Structure formats: C-alpha cells, structure tokens
Amino acid sequence: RSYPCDEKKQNDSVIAECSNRRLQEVPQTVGKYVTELDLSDNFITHITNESFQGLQNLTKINLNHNPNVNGLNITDGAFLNLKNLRELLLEDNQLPQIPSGLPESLTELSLIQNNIYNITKEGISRLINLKNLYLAWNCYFNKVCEKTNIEDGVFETLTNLELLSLSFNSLSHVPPKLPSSLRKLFLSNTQIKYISEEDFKGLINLTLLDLSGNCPRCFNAPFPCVPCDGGASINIDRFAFQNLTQLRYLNLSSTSLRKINAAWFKNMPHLKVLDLEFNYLVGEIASGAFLTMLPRLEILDLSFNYIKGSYPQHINISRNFSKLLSLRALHLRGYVFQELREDDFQPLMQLPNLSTINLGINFIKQIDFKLFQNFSNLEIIYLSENRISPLVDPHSNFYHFTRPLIKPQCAAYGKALDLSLNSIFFIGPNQFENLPDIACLNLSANSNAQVLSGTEFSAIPHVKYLDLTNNRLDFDNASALTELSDLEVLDLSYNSHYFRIAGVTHHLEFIQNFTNLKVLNLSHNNIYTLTDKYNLESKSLVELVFSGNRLDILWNDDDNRYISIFKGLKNLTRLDLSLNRLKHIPNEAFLNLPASLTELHINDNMLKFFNWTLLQQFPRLELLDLRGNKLLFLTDSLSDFTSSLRTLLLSHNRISHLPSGFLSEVSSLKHLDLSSNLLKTINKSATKLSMLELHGNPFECTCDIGDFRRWMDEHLNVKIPRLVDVICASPGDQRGKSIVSLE
Amino acid sequence: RSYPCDEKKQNDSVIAECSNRRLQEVPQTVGKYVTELDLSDNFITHITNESFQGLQNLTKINLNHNPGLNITDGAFLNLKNLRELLLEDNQLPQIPSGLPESLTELSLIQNNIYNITKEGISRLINLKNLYLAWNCYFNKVCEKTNIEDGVFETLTNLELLSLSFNSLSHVPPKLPSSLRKLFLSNTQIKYISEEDFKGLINLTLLDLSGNCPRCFNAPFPCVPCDGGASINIDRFAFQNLTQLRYLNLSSTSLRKINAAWFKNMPHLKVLDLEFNYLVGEIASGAFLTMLPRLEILDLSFNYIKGSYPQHINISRNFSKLLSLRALHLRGYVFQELREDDFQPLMQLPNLSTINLGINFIKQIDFKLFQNFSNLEIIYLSENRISPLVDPHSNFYHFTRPLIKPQCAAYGKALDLSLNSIFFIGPNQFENLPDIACLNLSANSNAQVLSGTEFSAIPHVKYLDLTNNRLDFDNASALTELSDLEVLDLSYNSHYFGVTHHLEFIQNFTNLKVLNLSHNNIYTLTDKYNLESKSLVELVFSGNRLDILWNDDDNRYISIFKGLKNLTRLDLSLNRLKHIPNEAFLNLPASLTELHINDNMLKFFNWTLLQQFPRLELLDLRGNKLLFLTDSLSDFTSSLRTLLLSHNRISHLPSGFLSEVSSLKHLDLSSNLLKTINKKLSMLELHGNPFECTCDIGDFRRWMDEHLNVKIPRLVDVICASPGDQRGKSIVSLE
Numbered sequence A: 001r002s003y004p005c006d007e008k009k010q011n012d013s014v015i016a017e018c019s020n021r022r023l024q025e026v027p028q029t030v031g032k033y034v035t036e037l038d039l040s041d042n043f044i045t046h047i048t049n050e051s052f053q054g055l056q057n058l059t060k061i062n063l064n065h066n067p068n069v070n071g072l073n074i075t076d077g078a079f080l081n082l083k084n085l086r087e088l089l090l091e092d093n094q095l096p097q098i099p100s101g102l103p104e105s106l107t108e109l110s111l112i113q114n115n116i117y118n119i120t121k122e123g124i125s126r127l128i129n130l131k132n133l134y135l136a137w138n139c140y141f142n143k144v145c146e147k148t149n150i151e152d153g154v155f156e157t158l159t160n161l162e163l164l165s166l167s168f169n170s171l172s173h174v175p176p177k178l179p180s181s182l183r184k185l186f187l188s189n190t191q192i193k194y195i196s197e198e199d200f201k202g203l204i205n206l207t208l209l210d211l212s213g214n215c216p217r218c219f220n221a222p223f224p225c226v227p228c229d230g231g232a233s234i235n236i237d238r239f240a241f242q243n244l245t246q247l248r249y250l251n252l253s254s255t256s257l258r259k260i261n262a263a264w265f266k267n268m269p270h271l272k273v274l275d276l277e278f279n280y281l282v283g284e285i286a287s288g289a290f291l292t293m294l295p296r297l298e299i300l301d302l303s304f305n306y307i308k309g310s311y312p313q314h315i316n317i318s319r320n321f322s323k324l325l326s327l328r329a330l331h332l333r334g335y336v337f338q339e340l341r342e343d344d345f346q347p348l349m350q351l352p353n354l355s356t357i358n359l360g361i362n363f364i365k366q367i368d369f370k371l372f373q374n375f376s377n378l379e380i381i382y383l384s385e386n387r388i389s390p391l392v393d394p395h396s397n398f399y400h401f402t403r404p405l406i407k408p409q410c411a412a413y414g415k416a417l418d419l420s421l422n423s424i425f426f427i428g429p430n431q432f433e434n435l436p437d438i439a440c441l442n443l444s445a446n447s448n449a450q451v452l453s454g455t456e457f458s459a460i461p462h463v464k465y466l467d468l469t470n471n472r473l474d475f476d477n478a479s480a481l482t483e484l485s486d487l488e489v490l491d492l493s494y495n496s497h498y499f500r501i502a503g504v505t506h507h508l509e510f511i512q513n514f515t516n517l518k519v520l521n522l523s524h525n526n527i528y529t530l531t532d533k534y535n536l537e538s539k540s541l542v543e544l545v546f547s548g549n550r551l552d553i554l555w556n557d558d559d560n561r562y563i564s565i566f567k568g569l570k571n572l573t574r575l576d577l578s579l580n581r582l583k584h585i586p587n588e589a590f591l592n593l594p595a596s597l598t599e600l601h602i603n604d605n606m607l608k609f610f611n612w613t614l615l616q617q618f619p620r621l622e623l624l625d626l627r628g629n630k631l632l633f634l635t636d637s638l639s640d641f642t643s644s645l646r647t648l649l650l651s652h653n654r655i656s657h658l659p660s661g662f663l664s665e666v667s668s669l670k671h672l673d674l675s676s677n678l679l680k681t682i683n684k685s686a687t688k689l690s691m692l693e694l695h696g697n698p699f700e701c702t703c704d705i706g707d708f709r710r711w712m713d714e715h716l717n718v719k720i721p722r723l724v725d726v727i728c729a730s731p732g733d734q735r736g737k738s739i740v741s742l743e
Numbered sequence B: 001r002s003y004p005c006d007e008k009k010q011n012d013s014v015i016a017e018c019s020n021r022r023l024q025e026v027p028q029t030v031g032k033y034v035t036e037l038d039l040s041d042n043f044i045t046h047i048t049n050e051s052f053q054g055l056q057n058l059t060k061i062n063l064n065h066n067p068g069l070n071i072t073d074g075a076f077l078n079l080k081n082l083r084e085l086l087l088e089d090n091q092l093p094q095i096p097s098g099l100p101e102s103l104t105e106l107s108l109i110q111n112n113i114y115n116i117t118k119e120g121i122s123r124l125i126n127l128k129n130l131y132l133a134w135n136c137y138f139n140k141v142c143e144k145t146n147i148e149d150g151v152f153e154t155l156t157n158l159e160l161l162s163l164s165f166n167s168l169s170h171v172p173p174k175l176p177s178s179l180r181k182l183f184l185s186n187t188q189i190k191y192i193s194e195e196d197f198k199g200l201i202n203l204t205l206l207d208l209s210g211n212c213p214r215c216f217n218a219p220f221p222c223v224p225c226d227g228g229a230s231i232n233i234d235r236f237a238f239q240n241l242t243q244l245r246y247l248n249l250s251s252t253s254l255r256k257i258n259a260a261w262f263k264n265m266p267h268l269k270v271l272d273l274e275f276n277y278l279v280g281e282i283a284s285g286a287f288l289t290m291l292p293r294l295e296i297l298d299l300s301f302n303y304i305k306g307s308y309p310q311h312i313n314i315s316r317n318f319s320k321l322l323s324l325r326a327l328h329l330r331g332y333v334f335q336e337l338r339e340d341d342f343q344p345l346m347q348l349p350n351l352s353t354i355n356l357g358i359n360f361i362k363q364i365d366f367k368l369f370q371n372f373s374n375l376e377i378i379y380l381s382e383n384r385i386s387p388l389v390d391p392h393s394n395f396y397h398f399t400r401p402l403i404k405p406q407c408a409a410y411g412k413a414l415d416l417s418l419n420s421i422f423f424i425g426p427n428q429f430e431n432l433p434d435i436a437c438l439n440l441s442a443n444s445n446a447q448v449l450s451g452t453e454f455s456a457i458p459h460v461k462y463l464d465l466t467n468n469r470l471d472f473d474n475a476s477a478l479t480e481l482s483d484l485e486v487l488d489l490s491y492n493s494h495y496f497g498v499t500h501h502l503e504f505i506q507n508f509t510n511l512k513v514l515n516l517s518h519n520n521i522y523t524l525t526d527k528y529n530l531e532s533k534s535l536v537e538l539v540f541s542g543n544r545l546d547i548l549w550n551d552d553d554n555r556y557i558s559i560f561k562g563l564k565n566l567t568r569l570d571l572s573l574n575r576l577k578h579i580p581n582e583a584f585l586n587l588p589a590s591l592t593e594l595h596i597n598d599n600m601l602k603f604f605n606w607t608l609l610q611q612f613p614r615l616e617l618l619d620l621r622g623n624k625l626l627f628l629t630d631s632l633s634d635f636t637s638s639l640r641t642l643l644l645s646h647n648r649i650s651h652l653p654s655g656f657l658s659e660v661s662s663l664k665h666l667d668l669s670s671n672l673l674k675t676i677n678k679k680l681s682m683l684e685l686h687g688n689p690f691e692c693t694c695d696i697g698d699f700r701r702w703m704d705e706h707l708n709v710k711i712p713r714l715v716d717v718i719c720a721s722p723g724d725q726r727g728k729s730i731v732s733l734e
C-alpha cells in the first residue's frame, strides 16, 4: 500500500499519481517500479540532485504548478542523475531561467508559464534529442521582460525537434536558424508583425504553422490586446510560404487581415485546415481569389469577422467556395446578417463532403430552410443564437471552439439541427416544412410556450433525440409529441410555465404512448402534483431523471395517490431522485419503485432513515447512491437484504458507527463510500471489496484505531484512495496527520 | 419579558407576535394587556373555553395555518371586544358554532366549509368583511357549496363578501344592500341573471374572473364551459350598479362585450379583460364609448393561438377614453407597431402608462411615443427590437410596479429589457422622447461603449445594463450621460479570463450608485484606483477582491481609496480569507455601511475601526471568525449595527457590550457560543450550542434585569447540552 502517491499499472509500466496532495517535497516513499511520477499542483519548493535518487528508472516527471498559494528552486544538475528521463514537465513554476544541466536523454520538455526571458545555448543545446520543446507563456504583458531574447542559433543543435512552441512571448521577429526537422511551429501572440521570405526557408517539413494573434483584432477582446496601430494586418511577404509545401494546418486568426494573398498557397497543395477567425474578411469572403488555391482544404473557420456597427440584410458568398472540393466543416460564426437565401449557399451545395455548416451567433431573422435539402452529406446544421421566429489553460485552442457543436449522443442518431437560443416563442405550423429528415433537434432556450397537441413535428416525424430544455412548454394534452413515434431521448430539463408562479400542475400521460422511448429528463421541473393519472407508464423507458422535483410533497400526500408514480415504468434500470427534498420515503412507495432497477440515486436529499430491509424488492440492483443526506445508521446485516448491490455511496452523511458484521459479509459489494461522515474509528468486528472511501472522517487516532491499520495492511487488495485526506481530528498532537503515519 | 410571544406596543394598542414558534397549545403565558394576538403558522390542534380565559381585552386573533383544527362550539363567546377573527388554512369542516356578535371581520379561507348556514353566521349582525374563498375547489368531496337561502341577508352591514374558489354554479340570492365588494372568481358561474345583482346599489367592485376561463396554457387546473363558451351575462345584469369602480372579467372567454353592461355605470375606474378572446372587440369596440371615467384598462393575453399578425388593430373608439391612465396590452402578440396604429391614444390627456410586454414585436416606429402629453412609463420588455441601422394575491393582473420605482422617479422610463439589442444601434435612440430611466437588461448586448451611444437621450439618470456582455474598457464609455446617477452593471461578463478598465467612473460629475456585482473582476489594466467625488454607493459583490488584494506589487492597496464621498460599500462574495491590514485602512473614511459578509474571513482587525469615525453598520455574516476584541469602545463610538451571524465565535469577551453605548443591534446567531458570562436594543443569539448547566443562568438573569433589550426568535435559542436539555429553549430551565 503506497503513500502518499496512488500507484498503478498503465499499459506495461507503473505510474505514480501524486498530484494535489499538499506535499512540501518530493517523497522518498515512492514505489521501486515507478517510471512516471506526477507531483503537480503541490507545495514543493526545492528540487536538488537528491530529490529523485533511488528512482533512476524514471521516464517522465511532471512538476507543474509548484508551489501554490517565490517560485521553484531547481539546483543545478538536479536531474542529470536520471539517465532515462524522456519527458519533463515544468509548467507554471515561476522559473526565472531555463534550468541548467538538464539530462541529454530528454525528448519532451515543457517550461510554459514561467518567467524565463533568455533562451540560451547553455540551457538547451546539449538536448540534441528533443522532439517536443514547449517554451510558451513566458513574456506577455509584464513589466519585464521587455522582450524574450533568443541567443542566435540555440536551436539547430536540435536536429530532431519536431515541435517548438514560442507562442505568447514578445519576439518581434521569427528566430533564425530553426531546425529542418520541425513539423509544427507555434508562434501565436508573439508580436511578430512582418513575415519575410527568409523567415521560414529550410523548414520543408512544416505541417503546422501558428501566427494567430499577431496584429490582434482587439475589438471586444477578453484579454489585454495591443493592436498593430493603423489597424494594420500582419504583414506577410508574397513568397513567405513558398518552400512550405507540406503545410497542413495554418492558423491566421486574429491577425487583422483584410486581404488574403492567393500567392501564399501557390505551393501548399495539401492545406487541410485554415483558421481565419477574428479578422476583417467580410470583403474577401465576398470575392475570395484564394478559395481557388485550396482544393484539399477540409476545415475553414471564418468566424467573427463581423463589421462593427453593421447588421446587413444578406450574407455574400463568393462563387469560389465551390472550388473547396474537400471541405467538411465551414465555420461561419458571428458574421452577423439578417436573411439567408437559397441562392446565397449555391456554392456550398456542390461540395460533396461538406458535413458541418456552423452558422452560430449571426442573429439571423429569416432562413430559407429548403436550401439544406440540397446537400448530399449535411450531418450538423448548427444555428444557435439566431433570431428565427415562429413560422406562419494554455494547452487549449485559444480561438476556435473545438469541442462538439452538438452533443454526440444526439448527433449519433443522424442529421442534427440546433435552433437553441433563437426567437421561436411558439412552434409555428410551418416551422419545420422543407427540412430534410432530422434525427436530432435542439429547441433549447427559446422562451417557447407551445401547447403540444401532436401535430407540431409532423414535417420531421423521425426525430429521435429532442432537446426542449429551458422553455415554458405545456404538455397537458396526452397527444403531446405523439407524432414522433421513433423518439428515443427527450430532455425537458428546466421546463416551467411562462409565469414562474408557484402552483403549476403537470399531465404526464403523453409518455405512455411511446413504444421505444428510452431516456426522459424531467430535472428541475418542480413537479408536486399530477392531474387525473397519478402514474407514469412505459413499457420501453430505461432512464428517468426526476431530480429537482417535489417528490417530498407527492409521497406525503395523506390520501396516497402517488404510492405508485413510477411502478408502471416496467423496464426502468436507472432512476435519479436526487434534489427532491426527501426526509423519508413511505416504505410502500419505495417498494413500488420498479423492480427492474439497477441504479438508484437518492443523493442530495434530507433522508434521516433508510429501510435497508426493502432492498429485497430489488434483485437486480447494483448501484445505490445515498450521498449528501442526513443518515445516522446502517443495518447490522446487509447480505440478508440484497445479494446484488455492487456500489453503495454514503458520503456526506452523519454516520458515527459501523455495525458488527456489516462488511462481514456484504458479499457482492465492491465499492463502498463512507467518506465525509462522522466515524471516529472502526471495530475489527465491522469480502469481495475493492474500494473503500474514508477521507473526511473525524478519526480518533489512539491505539484503538490500530485494529484498523492492521486490517488495512492485511488487505492490500482493497483500494483506499486519497489517504492524504484520511485525517486525525484527535488527539492533536495527531490532528491533521494521515492515519498511516502512527505506530 | 413575555414568553413565548414577542410583545411590542403600536399606537394606543399592543401586539403580541407569536407565530412560527412550534407551539402545540395557546399559551396561558400571555400579557394581560394584549389586544392583538397572532398565533399563526404553528402546531396547534385545540381551542377551548379557557384557551382564552381572561383576555376580554382582545380584539384580533390570528390562528391561520394550524396545525384538522378543533374548536369547541362557543369557544370565542366570552370575548365581547372581539372584532377580527382569522381562521384560514385550518382544515375546518364547518363554520365554528357560536361566534361573538361583536365580529366585524371573519376569515375562513382554505378550509373545507361546504355549507354556509344561518346557524353559522346569521347572528353575526356586525360583520363587515367575510372571506370564504378556497373551500370547495377540486376535491371529490363537495360537488357544490350549499348556501342557505337568505343566510347573508341578515348581515345588513356587510361590505365585503368573498367566495372565490368555490363551486357555487350561480350567484346566491338575497344579498344585503350594503355589499360594496363582492368577489366571485373561479366559482363555476356561467350565467348572470338580471336578478342576481338586483339593487346592490353600494357595490364598487365585482369580481367574476375565471368563470368560463381561457384554459389554454393555464398553470393551475382549469375547465372551460362546454365549447370555447363564454360566461353569459344578461344584458341587464349590471343595471342598478352605478357605484362600480372595479370590474374583473379576466378569463371568462369573452369574444363579445355588450356595451349596455356599462350603460348605468358612469364611474367605472378599473376594468380587467385579461385572458379572453377579444382581438375582435379591440378592433371594433362599442363598449369603448361607454367608459369616459376609466383609468386602468387591461386587455393582456388575448392572443389568438397559432397567429403572429404583422399589426395591432386599435379601434378609434380608444379615444373615447378621456380619463385613461394605464393601458395594458401584454401578450397580444404582433410584429410591427406603426405610428398610425396608436393614433387613438395620442391625445388621451392623462395616459401615463403603456405596457406592451411580451408581444414579440420586431419593429416599432419609436417617434410615435413623442406624440403623447403625459407618458411616464413605456414598458416594452420581452419584444424583439433589433439593433437599429397565496389566496390574497391577484391571480391575473399582477401588481408590483412595472419598473423599479427608484428608476421611474427620475422621469420618463423606457424598459427595453429582454429584446434583441445585441449591440447598440447608431440610430437606436433617435426619435425617442427625453428619457430619464432606461432598462437595457438582458439583450445579449456586446457593445464596445465609446462615449456616443446614448447622446440622443443624454438626460438618462438611471441606466440598467444588467445581464449583458458590455465592454467598457474605453475611458469614454457612457460619459455622454453627464447627468447619470445610477448605473447597474450586475452580471456582466465577456461573451467568451477577462480584464477591466474602470477609468470611465471618474468622468461623472453626478454619479451616485454604481453596481458591479458578479463581474468577476480580478484585474484592472493601467489605472489601479477607482476615483470619484460624487459616488455614494458601490456594490462590488461577487468579484475577486481576494486576488486583487494578494497582488505582489501591491497595485490595488488603494482600489477605492479615491471614492471620497463613499458611504456604502459591499465586498460580499469576494472569497476573502484575509484583508491586508493597510488595504483595509485605505477604504473611504466616509463609510457609513460596510458589508464584508459571505467571504471566508479567519481574522478581523477590530482596532482599525478607528480609521472609520462614521461607520454605523458593520456586516461580517457568513465568515470563519474566531475572535471578538474585549475593548471595542477604544475603536469606535459610531457603530450601531454589528452583524456576525454564521461565524465560529465560541467566546464573548466580558463587558464586550460594556460600554459600546453606540451599539443598538448585535447579531451573534449561528455561532459557537456555549455560553455568556459577566444601551442595546436587539441581540440575536439563536443557533448556538448553549450549555444549560447551572453556571450561566447568570445570562438568564442578565436578561431579566434588561427588559428594554429585544431578543428575537427566543424559542430558537436552544440548549445543545447537557441533554436531555438538548432541544429545550434556554428560557425554560431552572
């Protein structure tokens, strides 16, 4: 049993997860087999040639974010002992210089978020084996440095370097003497205003070049931002990319470009992805000579080149967009325009592989929706943050929202269409005419108050995943949504009435109708009474998320109407009853919970009593989640009630005693979470167990606890995570120390 | 010191607050003098002869929300000065037998009283206001409220009679002539006879709302008459009702309004026609010519389902409304407002309020609001303007000012909240009248303010920009409003790690109140001080003063040093563990009210209160404070109100109060005091783990010696130990 780090196999090696544990120094108590050690986000202040002895097999060390709440003191040659160190991460360490005498065995070095202003031969030219060198975020908006200083030809000794990142350093100019081994050169936000012909010669293996943020488009810029003055674009010489014939990724976002020289791509027959966000290219989009130079371009971002002060009727799309044969995703966020017509997108209708059109946040009023029928491969039509009316961390892409436009689980069903955050206040009768066949649909957050009658979705009868979150919908008619017989997922999360006055009823009879409905989410609907039918019914449903409702009211109904609300959901395996303000559950009510359950969540309620006997009603149950409640005790023999339960989550409760033979014998239990409770100790009197969580208990650390210590040691198979936070409250002297420290 | 009731005199009388104390019976522990006894919201089950034994000097008794409640026939008879009895939410099956003739007001709301019998109330001759709403409404038991013939006819001083939320089917016969306010909402009365309201010549208010309701999109249950069928009101229904000031026909499913209804009704002042089907009537509108004295017309939510018309059709007969003060056309739902459409309201001399909330209007011809003599309130919330290039509440017409009063006070108010003004248009404000109060809240507004956006309405005194994404980095931002006094930027953040420039504040000659709550301010660029000679109030809640004051170079040690007129400052929710000792001394010495609550303070340097000779109120609630100083007098003589609840203070320094004569109100509720040892007016102790051992029944006597000092919530100052005692109130032990 390791301490303080959590140690485990990874692939074919053993790894030491030692992060966020308040260590003031590299431990010497690390396993012998460990080759990767993560000490990041700690209180480590100094590193000497002695810190990592007896650990010479180490391949990778991560020291990021040390220390927390002056920087890190790295003695010279501190690491020269480690003859196998490949990857060394020193990020956010407040380093004042490149540490000297770093092992020549290194292949990946990261020194981002430090105060390093000199890049010297001393520091890193002995490191002939570097593949990946990351020096970013060192001089930006800081009294010093004035300017990062790059000793002429530091690199070039680096004949194996493939990745170099100098982004976010005041460089003013591209370093000369860069190795020809480079494939990826990151120079975002480096105050490089001009790109000579000479600057990138000899880099005939370049696959990626990042020059974003040079001559920022500073307008409404979240971070500080010093534009070039004259509002001038970066200045790239004509033939400046002529011997870059491998370039696959070019990121010119936020370089104040008005004009794009088609010369730049003359020798770039493979350009795959072009970032042009945060520029002034409305003009160039209208004409665009350069579009003829990019028959292999797969991803084009022209987002956020709107013209301040302006809100034009139509978008202007060059004919040349049709020369983009290989285009897969066109990102046209925040161009800002009112009407979009069939004819405006004629160019894109020919592109065979175009599957994503992103028209996010253009505040568009009218769209000619039939136009999307005319595309062989549209999979994702993303129209969030428009005005359609009813119809009668420095390791993140800084500029292009890379996470999915639409929830995988929704898009997985087919063509997706996102109309969230528009003006669709009711669903017009022509709302969805001329749409192609949509499988996934977002109407979230449209202040939408439709009285659903069963005819609103007839034009797209095959929607499978429907997101209606954050509207004001009325599904009192039991025909509601019936035209969607293939619907599999429904999200009514956060749905209320338009008045947001307390006292709203709900009819849930529409649910029973669906023969393959699988997931329904009524979270935060504030349901306290159903009208007429007091049972939900489904032969298909598998998941109901009922959180943020008033089951506390429903089950305390003195006349007993909701004793079986859920029983008729006959296939249900997962039920989330969290946040329902539950003090206790009528025994009768709990025994009507569908016997089919596998996972039950009653966490974050106010339960003070739980009838462990009732788990006999539930032969298939595996996960029971009673976290964040007010429970005082546990039944002294669980086995007798269930032989199915795998995981029991009790954390954030008021349990001070473990019953005798509680764990002897739970039998089928693997994960037990008794963390943040009121245990002071554990009897030896209290198995197939494999996680036991205990951090956050006010443990009395005397000789009484010694029982448990030797139970732990004689049960290494049972993981107990997070030891650091298994804290003695008493008796300080002991207080604050980990219960693994005593004798 | 009355227990358990808190007692205090108001005018000649004397009140005994006695609610929310978990009482199971009527204390015989009651001040003999008490004339008003409030017992509501408790755990009471029985009322007897000698539940009020020697209390003949009682005048009002409230027993609402208890615990059903059981009352002995004649339980109240003894009390010959009993005027007002309130018995709501009591689960009563019948009207208590034998009630004092003396009653002028009775209330039996939210009970199960299905029969109104002479036996019950025919003796109560002096009744003026009788409330019986919500007894027979959607519970299978009681199909119908049974009302004895002429039961109310002996009540011949009866002014107000409410029976709303009861199935009656028809207006009861034999009502007394002295009725002035008859409330019959939600009663299932689809027909009004001529005889129903015969001769009620003192009526000023009639409520028929909710009979044959517009059930479509109704929050609570709802059942229309058969078909979309309207209430049926006989042509003569209202013929002898000349006094009527108030008529509520909300949600009666009206398509047609018979102008004859108003023939004999020249003084009608307020008329509710909300939630009906009168798009037609609004276009034609005969009834409109019969309403010369009407002041508040409400036509809200008459929208036709499925429809979204370009225009609104106002009949020209809208000009026959010469007394009009407020028109409420919410939820009509239309797309364009042309100058011509509101011709009929333009010379109505006293029209001060137009409310067009929730119409989803895309375009308005704004110059038209210039053709109005007395507009004060133009309410356009929840439309689509683009950038230009409880029983006793009102079910339907909601009452709560349309615009914060504080804003409206300044002059003409324009609320364009919840529209689509995603930036500020070059011509957004051209051809508006002279606006004093503007609400731009929640338009997803990303304007980079440059100092010229507002110059067509430069006389804005109160500007509300909350819930947008404004960029005010430029030092000229908003300066064009040199008369600006209130600025609200609550919840403003970038549309995507964002820094702030605040220089713009200094330029204002007359700015009173600045609100920056929830701006996640962690850094200022260039200038590190806020500066103003006018600012009285700053709200800096929900920002990163923890980061700013833990700067290495100490840039922000004088962030507010230069708000030299500052009286009120709010540093709540800033994640403060620790305020650097001299940063605290650089807060305006002008300060009167300093709020540092809902942070994480471990320590507080009580000495530094010397530098603040004006401080009346200090608020440190919701922190982790361990200690109070013993010598608070040395450090201030100004402080009146100190608030410490929700801290970890287990010790009260001896003679802490003695002598901080200045202190009037001291809140130590929800702290760790186990006890209290050896000129104040309130002291809050509840929520403390008191030890109820014999030592420190000192404090118990210290309470007796000082009756002047008020302790609220006494039933909740609760022994934790040794217990046994655990759960008992401190007051009870011996």
Ligand SMILES: *[C@@H]1O[C@H](CO)[C@@H](O[C@@H]2O[C@H](CO)[C@@H](O[C@@H]3O[C@H](CO[C@H]4O[C@H](CO)[C@@H](O)[C@H](O)[C@@H]4O)[C@@H](O)[C@H](O[C@H]4O[C@H](CO)[C@@H](O)[C@H](O)[C@@H]4O)[C@@H]3O)[C@H](O)[C@H]2NC(C)=O)[C@H](O)[C@H]1NC(C)=O
Pocket (backbone or CB within 6 Å): A409, A410, A469, A489, A491, A493, A519, A520, A521, A523, A543, A545
């Ligand atoms: C309304 O209610 C629904 C139903 O709950 C919510 O939608 C579900 O949301 C949950 C998360 O809240 C989703 O669960 C997550 O799925 C992710 C996708 O998993 C991939 O890989 C797994 C491997 O097993 C596959 O099963 C799956 O097909 C995918 O290929 C996972 O990333 C998530 O894993 C979580 O657990 C592990 C720990 O075990 C963590 O390491 C992860 O970080 C993570 O937290 C998780 O399982 C679920 O898939 C959604 N379902 C549907 C149908 O949409 C909605 O969110 C809710 N709506 C609103 C508004 O709240």
Ligand SMILES: *[C@@H]1O[C@H](CO)[C@@H](O[C@@H]2O[C@H](CO)[C@@H](O[C@@H]3O[C@H](CO[C@H]4O[C@H](CO)[C@@H](O)[C@H](O)[C@@H]4O)[C@@H](O)[C@H](O)[C@@H]3O)[C@H](O)[C@H]2NC(C)=O)[C@H](O)[C@H]1NC(C)=O
Pocket (backbone or CB within 6 Å): B404, B406, B407, B466, B486, B488, B490, B513, B514, B515, B517, B537, B539
């Ligand atoms: C941003 O900060 C603003 C300034 O703090 C917030 O506005 C303030 O809101 C408080 C309450 O949150 C108001 O105080 C209330 O005012 C009413 C009315 O007071 C006036 O009239 C009464 C008689 O009716 C009289 O007694 C007073 O003397 C007043 O003249 C009080 O009745 C309440 O008890 C309470 O004090 C401030 O008045 C108000 N200031 C302004 C300038 O509006 C604002 O809400 C904040 N924004 C957000 C989003 O939170």
Ligand SMILES: *[C@@H]1O[C@H](CO)[C@@H](O[C@@H]2O[C@H](CO)[C@@H](O[C@H]3O[C@H](CO[C@H]4O[C@H](CO)[C@@H](O)[C@H](O)[C@@H]4O)[C@@H](O)[C@H](O)[C@@H]3O)[C@H](O)[C@H]2NC(C)=O)[C@H](O)[C@H]1NC(C)=O
Pocket (backbone or CB within 6 Å): B181, B185, B205, B206, B207, B209, B246, B247, B248, B270, B272, B391, B392, B393, B394, B395, B396, B397
């Ligand atoms: C149909 O429209 C009717 C208007 O014709 C509505 O009648 C109004 O009913 C409301 C809600 O029950 C009632 O509530 C208010 O009155 C109580 C008494 O007023 C006191 O306080 C005020 C304020 O300071 C003062 O001006 C008064 O003199 C008095 O002292 C208040 O306790 C309560 O908080 C509330 O303000 C209205 O007074 C009543 N209007 C009249 C003129 O009687 C009716 O509600 C509506 N029906 C439905 C179902 O919506």
Ligand SMILES: *[C@@H]1O[C@H](CO)[C@@H](O[C@@H]2O[C@H](CO)[C@@H](O[C@@H]3O[C@H](CO)[C@@H](O)[C@H](O)[C@@H]3O)[C@H](O)[C@H]2NC(C)=O)[C@H](O)[C@H]1NC(C)=O
Pocket (backbone or CB within 6 Å): A184, A188, A208, A210, A212, A249, A250, A251, A273, A275, A394, A395, A396, A397, A398, A399, A400
């Ligand atoms: C400008 O655009 C380029 C692409 O043209 C962006 O390059 C990408 O940068 C992101 C963020 O670092 C990289 O993602 C990372 O990948 C690695 C390795 O698989 C992983 O460790 C990280 O978790 C993350 O997934 C991405 O690889 C890199 N793209 C390529 C093709 O190398 C660049 O960030 C843009 N510049 C700015 C300032 O936004």
Ligand SMILES: *[C@@H]1O[C@H](CO)[C@@H](O[C@@H]2O[C@H](CO)[C@@H](O)[C@H](O)[C@H]2NC(C)=O)[C@H](O)[C@H]1NC(C)=O
Pocket (backbone or CB within 6 Å): A384, A405, A406, A407, A410, A418, A420, A421, A442, A443, A444, A445, A467
């Ligand atoms: C439908 O649109 C809404 C709004 O765009 C999406 O909501 C976002 O969801 C993610 C993950 O659930 C959150 O982190 C964001 O904060 C949400 N944004 C907002 C503005 O609320 C929603 O996920 C979309 N639905 C689908 C199925 O993709």
Ligand SMILES: *[C@@H]1O[C@H](CO)[C@@H](O[C@@H]2O[C@H](CO)[C@@H](O)[C@H](O)[C@H]2NC(C)=O)[C@H](O)[C@H]1NC(C)=O
Pocket (backbone or CB within 6 Å): B381, B402, B403, B404, B405, B407, B415, B417, B418, B439, B440, B441, B442, B464
């Ligand atoms: C501007 O418009 C907003 C939106 O209607 C108003 O916001 C309300 O503020 C009050 C507090 O005064 C809250 O109780 C409500 O919840 C808010 N309503 C909404 C819909 O958010 C705001 O009051 C208006 N500003 C002024 C100055 O009148």
Ligand SMILES: COc1ccc2c(-c3ccc(O)c(C)c3)ccnc2c1
Pocket (backbone or CB within 6 Å): A220, A306, A307, A308, A309, A310, A311, A334, A335, A336, A361, B422, B423, B444, B445, B446, B447, B448, B449, B495
């Ligand atoms: C003077 O400052 C501005 C600021 C913002 C805009 C915008 C704008 C607004 C909100 C948005 O979400 C997007 C993408 C753009 C459009 C036009 N003109 C402006 C002028």
Ligand SMILES: COc1ccc2c(-c3ccc(O)c(C)c3)ccnc2c1
Pocket (backbone or CB within 6 Å): A425, A426, A427, A447, A448, A449, A450, A451, A452, A498, B303, B304, B305, B306, B307, B308, B331, B332, B333, B358
């Ligand atoms: C069949 O269901 C509906 C539901 C709602 C409407 C609405 C509507 C929506 C939301 C609102 O706030 C207002 C005031 C009206 C307008 C038209 N036709 C409808 C049809």
Ligand SMILES: *[C@@H]1O[C@H](CO)[C@@H](O)[C@H](O)[C@H]1NC(C)=O
Pocket (backbone or CB within 6 Å): A325, A326, A352, A353
């Ligand atoms: C489109 O995608 C397919 C399969 O991924 C690929 O074979 C084809 O080359 C692509 N089309 C073009 C024009 O590049």
Ligand SMILES: *[C@@H]1O[C@H](CO)[C@@H](O)[C@H](O)[C@H]1NC(C)=O
Pocket (backbone or CB within 6 Å): A539, A540, A542, A571, A573
């Ligand atoms: C119930 O759902 C499970 C998947 O959760 C599935 O294996 C089973 O076939 C379903 N049975 C019915 C009747 O829906």
Ligand SMILES: *[C@@H]1O[C@H](CO)[C@@H](O)[C@H](O)[C@H]1NC(C)=O
Pocket (backbone or CB within 6 Å): B509, B510, B533, B534, B535, B536, B565
């Ligand atoms: C400072 O505040 C006081 C009280 O509101 C006021 O009388 C005075 O005019 C203000 N000072 C300035 C310079 O505006």
